[PDB]
Design a protein around this ligand. Sequence first.
Ligand SMILES: Cc1cc2nc3c(=O)[nH]c(=O)nc-3n(C[C@H](O)[C@H](O)[C@H](O)COP(=O)(O)OP(=O)(O)OC[C@H]3O[C@@H](n4cnc5c(N)ncnc54)[C@H](O)[C@@H]3O)c2cc1C
Ligand SMILES: Cc1cc2nc3c(=O)[nH]c(=O)nc-3n(C[C@H](O)[C@H](O)[C@H](O)COP(=O)(O)OP(=O)(O)OC[C@H]3O[C@@H](n4cnc5c(N)ncnc54)[C@H](O)[C@@H]3O)c2cc1C
Lengths: 607, 612
Amino acid sequence: MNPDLRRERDSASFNPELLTHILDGSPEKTRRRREIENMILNDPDFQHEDLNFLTRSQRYEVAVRKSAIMVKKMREFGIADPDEIMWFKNFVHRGRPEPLDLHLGMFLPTLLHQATAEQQERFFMPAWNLEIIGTYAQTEMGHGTHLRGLETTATYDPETQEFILNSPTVTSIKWWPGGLGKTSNHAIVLAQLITKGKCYGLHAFIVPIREIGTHKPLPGITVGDIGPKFGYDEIDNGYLKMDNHRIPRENMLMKYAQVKPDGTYVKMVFVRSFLVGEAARALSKACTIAIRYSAVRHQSEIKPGEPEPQILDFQTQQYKLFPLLATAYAFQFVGAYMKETYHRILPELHALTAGLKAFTSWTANTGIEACRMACGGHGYSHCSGLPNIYVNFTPSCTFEGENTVMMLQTARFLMKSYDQVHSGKLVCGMVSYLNDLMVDINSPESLTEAYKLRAARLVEIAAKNLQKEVIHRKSKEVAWNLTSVDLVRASEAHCHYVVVKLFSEKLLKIQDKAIQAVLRSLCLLYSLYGISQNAGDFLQGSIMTEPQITQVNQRVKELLTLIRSDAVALVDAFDFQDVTLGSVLGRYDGNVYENLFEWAKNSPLNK
Amino acid sequence: MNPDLRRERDSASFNPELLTHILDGSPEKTRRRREIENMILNDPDFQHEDLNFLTRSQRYEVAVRKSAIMVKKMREFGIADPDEIMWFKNFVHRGRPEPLDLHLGMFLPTLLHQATAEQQERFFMPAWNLEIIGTYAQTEMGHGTHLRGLETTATYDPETQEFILNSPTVTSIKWWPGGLGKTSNHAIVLAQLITKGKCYGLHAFIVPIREIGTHKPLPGITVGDIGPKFGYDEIDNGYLKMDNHRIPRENMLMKYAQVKPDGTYVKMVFVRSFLVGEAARALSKACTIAIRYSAVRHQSEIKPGEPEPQILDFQTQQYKLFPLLATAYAFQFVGAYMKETYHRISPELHALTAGLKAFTSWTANTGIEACRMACGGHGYSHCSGLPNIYVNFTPSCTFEGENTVMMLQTARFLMKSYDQVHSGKLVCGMVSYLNDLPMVDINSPESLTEAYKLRAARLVEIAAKNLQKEVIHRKSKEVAWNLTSVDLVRASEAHCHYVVVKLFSEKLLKIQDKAIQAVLRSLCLLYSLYGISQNAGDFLQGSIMTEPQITQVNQRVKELLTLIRSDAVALVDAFDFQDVTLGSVLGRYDGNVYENLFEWAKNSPLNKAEVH
Ligand SMILES: Cc1cc2nc3c(=O)[nH]c(=O)nc-3n(C[C@H](O)[C@H](O)[C@H](O)COP(=O)(O)OP(=O)(O)OC[C@H]3O[C@@H](n4cnc5c(N)ncnc54)[C@H](O)[C@@H]3O)c2cc1C
Ligand SMILES: Cc1cc2nc3c(=O)[nH]c(=O)nc-3n(C[C@H](O)[C@H](O)[C@H](O)COP(=O)(O)OP(=O)(O)OC[C@H]3O[C@@H](n4cnc5c(N)ncnc54)[C@H](O)[C@@H]3O)c2cc1C
């Protein structure tokens, strides 16, 4: 072990083992997760050349093969709990996305929960056996956010009792779906339903796209890879063009609506919750690499005659990393809170889940790159593992609701809540602070209240600005568009308050007093950093005075010093194995330099 | 031409051709640049497969080759003139870094400036035929920022009149230098000079590393590529392990220090300037792609049931992109001001270049990714060109002085300047605003510069006073510096922000064309007012502005977005990037995205077969 890391670990104020239990949810969840990862770690079937050394084609081949053996192995070892499947999937794929994600994550769940019994007979087992490989084709070249503008049609033919699936234009072609290019022989296709001569809107269809066995595209199917991307090298993100392709009537998903044989027409928070936890995980891994490597890397001078200190001793380096470390923990607890209240429980839930998806993904996105730039040159090399974490996490800000649009869906629920209050009614939950229309900087409860007042101020500015535009502009929709920057600021401040409140609240449930102490130092640093970084939002409305902002900035610098001796153990508690970080700089043992020279010598331009 | 791009172009308030002249410096520089680009455009020798469809080894092969053909062709056409060489190199390489950069920019220039006739006679002449290909090996796996901590040794042997170049440790190994991997047969190596007695600190040594013919590595020499990176696929960024390797004593560069045969020992600022222009250019390309694509892309609804509008009509899309286009222009004018100051030039220049290199590169870095995310899904595809612009620009924040270190140099200068003014002496230059230590008009660039001045003065004074407090507390200046370093970086940031607003504001008064001046005025006001909006706290404290003034700043930014909307396509056209320089289906001049996108994908590698 590198003696800087052993020393850092020996001087910690808390037992990281106990903090891993808190993050997993219980000691048994830690044991069960470690057992699953340790099932995989030395399995040769899950070993391969470093993926940064391979072509995109080879990376795709490696990932598809792993996803197959892994479906087989999970069944052999009888792993079947949804948490456990995800522990297994995560560790097999080492942070990379995996080509059966849509089959296992959308196609199979959709069959079990949205398909008819006769659809399940026909499709479910061949899908579970990977005889049928499925994807979900929603987005078109021309439309992703506005699904009402999707051009794909499903036209009912009563003479043959089929749906005719059509891509009438180049923009109409399905674009992005994972596994669509090369892997899948079936797709669930979102299409505008036309029956008689009327459109009834968006409905979902099971569409065979390739021959089972041969994998040849069916007549009237054009399908392929959309080409290389910033990341997702391992995923055959694909296009699908349908030329009036016919399917049985009975391939429509009729859970909420039906077409009769004569043509008559009768009348997710899970994934956004998962994405907050993925934001936590990605930022956590990035903080682990950069903080360990900051404890290993010596550079430059503080005391002029003295040896090069660890760069983590520089107040600037602390300022780059510790507020991210605090942010990581905060997001870990927001992700847990939302997972544990989705099973408990709605307009607020939808609004809250959209906003936190956007808030956590944006903030983690920026975090990861600040972590990479904090390592200096070696950060930029794939030896850091930080480029792959960035490029594979960043599309979280665009898919499953583009972040700006999500914040506007949040703002709609905040304006609805504002109008409810000013019309004399009462609102509930996280927006209950809208009913009410001097800070102690070492109190999480007191900073939560500061963040509450910031949100109420920005929500009232958005409402009033909106009210003036509604009175002045030619349409309410123009008024909305011309208030949209202020509506996003309101949704943002709302989300930031929710994160402070949830992290503050978690502290009271920590049983171990040493862990409660260091999490409180993270919760205070998160809250105080956010005030420092948004001072104007606390100064206006007189929520806080200039002297208090001075004291906020003094306390942030002290918290950096408090956190320094606990930083390594705090990232150690995330419990990422070296193979999950993919990082020479961030190895558990801190032996970077001998391993960097090996990695570099073995790399491809030296054959 | 896409009819949305035709309509926007036709209703522009100004002539983008005259703005290109302002950016290039004259109508003749524009014409000459375009001529060099257009002879490179029709040269079959500079043409290759889509770089996005190739492996890293193929990318490197395509690059070193275009770089060799490029040296030969610039001699043939007599392309001398630094501006012309830059225009030629920029266009051949299409935004990618160039694997002869260290050869042409550090090896040959160092031989011409520093080498004695003897050294120049046996080195610079075959180097000018590409028989010798050199590099400059400064950084080690263990040291980059702190050069004094370099571990490579050059020990003098008085007997055999040689230097011993040794790499004692794995950390000592030279690491990163462009060309060092595969390209170079020769390196200027930076080492600690030990002669008989002890060490006389950092000196340069000419170390041949590969044979001139076999290109085989010399005895004592271990050399290779450091592996794949976030970008720079085209560059064999390299390592160099020297095993007590022997070189003649006349291999030491001795323009300012010498070692006699008796072993007797006797006696980054142009680059930083250039990187400011690089920050400007990279941000400008990203704005070009995102603003054109935003004028082409229709999505979602304003009045429900009316046609889906161009996404550039959404205020949020305007707020992501117009502030960045205003920054791209600010940065073009800061780059030109640096170039113009350097040529002409009683220190401030070192401080100001460091701080402006860090300020601009950090801000451009953030802005390129914002442009990419503004394009939605298609942004993330290499079809957008934006992932490449970002990965090949981003190391600018790390190399040629790590940005935080550079802001800390700028802050040494600001603290010295502060102490000087508070001891009664007058400072000059961009810090002359400190001399003046003890209602803002938001339509006046001059009054907005003044606000920025007061913001900077406030944060400089806070850094200074916080530093004095820690000095008396800890009784160590170097420790008190560390414990103030976050405040000190904040003072340099605000200083550099002020300088940018000042220069943009002052550029507006030299614009001849009234219509151009009026729109650049709108960009300058948008830059200034967005910066206040984003930093309202730094203006609210010390009573520089009031809450009601921040309210009006916010109203005026919303107004300038609407005004800039009808000029935004023309403003990005005026950067005069060719399609092949942008490398972007989304950002093509003609706005024909969708049919071109489908062709691009259909021809991409995984569609060589239907079943993989
Ligand atoms: C790696 C990756 C994997 C994907 N996987 C899948 C998949 O498996 N299946 C699939 O069907 N799709 C998939 N997608 C596509 C994804 O669903 C879309 O990218 C997403 O819906 C965003 O839509 P868009 O890309 O068309 O962006 P657009 O909707 O075109 O928007 C682009 C810009 O317009 C702005 N904008 C749009 N509407 C508004 C509005 N109403 N108000 C204000 N601003 C607005 C956005 O904020 C953004 O700034 C994937 C995408 C990626 C990048
Ligand atoms: C793409 C690329 C190309 C390169 N090409 C070349 C090349 O051609 N030739 C060459 O010689 N080099 C090259 N380099 C290396 C480059 O010069 C170094 O990366 C740079 O000098 C930074 O030092 P470092 O990487 O050792 O980071 P470090 O110096 O180890 O710094 C890492 C961290 O420590 C912090 N830190 C360091 N010192 C201080 C301090 N005094 N105060 C506070 N914090 C501090 C930094 O802020 C940073 O966050 C290249 C690098 C890259 C990424």
